[PDB]
Ligand SMILES: *C(=O)N1C[C@H](NOS(=O)(=O)O)CC[C@H]1C(N)=O
Ligand SMILES: [Cl-]
């Protein structure tokens with residue numbers, strides 16, 4: 272019945288802002304879980320960039336790539352929203368710096384460059400996810416087109432549960448070795464976009480690593496996080512939303528609230 276109460280609360284919240292909320296949360300210290308719409312599809316938007324950074328680190332770990340190899344792009348027309356790659360166009364960036372920009376600032380140039388040159392495009396990004404046992408995730412298009420968040424479209428979607436399981440595996444599990452996982456965690460912990468989301472749903476002294484997504488259409492926005500509560504084993508929270516209408520804006524406050532509810536549901 273605690274699951275049932277949390278379900279009623281999410282259902283009401285999603286009705287209050289005329290949209291759809293999907294939630295999965297895991298307490299890693301007990302195995303307890305909470306889901307609502309946990310198997311339904313939601314656009315990933317920028318959130319997939321957190322997995323794209325994990326894929327680079329796996330490549331590094333495998334000695335396929337080097338974390339400090341110079342990535343050069345002096346002639347490229349940077350995609351819109353490339354705040355970090357635009358500052359280093361003249362000089363190039365290290366591969367590790369590039370991947371972390373794609374994660375912590377959602378940098379679109381960084382994303383496109385990495386998929387074109389190191390990850391085998393959207394199909395290769397999908398391949399990596401299948402290789403960690405994620406069967407729901409799919410990326411179909413490149414930046415910026417992956418963001419259209421058309422209702423009923425299944426391109427560039429995943430499920431809250433699968434995203435949560437995958438972040439569990441990547442941030443806490445054993446896909447990455449102890450060394451390279453620490454780096455991923457640090458990247459996550461220093462995300463710059465997430466302050467009004469899962470982060471705002473927890474005490475200021477809990478440590479959080481997250482990655483947000485804001486398609487910019489259909490009120491579509493999301494966040495996933497590892498939370499290290501003080502004196503307790505880590506939580507995983509995954510929150511996805513869509514809204515009914517094209518011009519609807521996303522709601523940071525609904526995400527934060529949905530995370531507050533999900534985190535009490537697994538208390
Ligand atoms: C991510 O969805 N995008 C990059 C940028 N927003 O960063 S955030 O989503 O992490 O907050 C603008 C919108 C969107 C994109 N690819 O256009
Ligand atoms: Cl996923």
Ligand SMILES: [Cl-]
Pocket residue numbers: 464465466467468469470471481494496
């Ligand atoms: Cl957040």
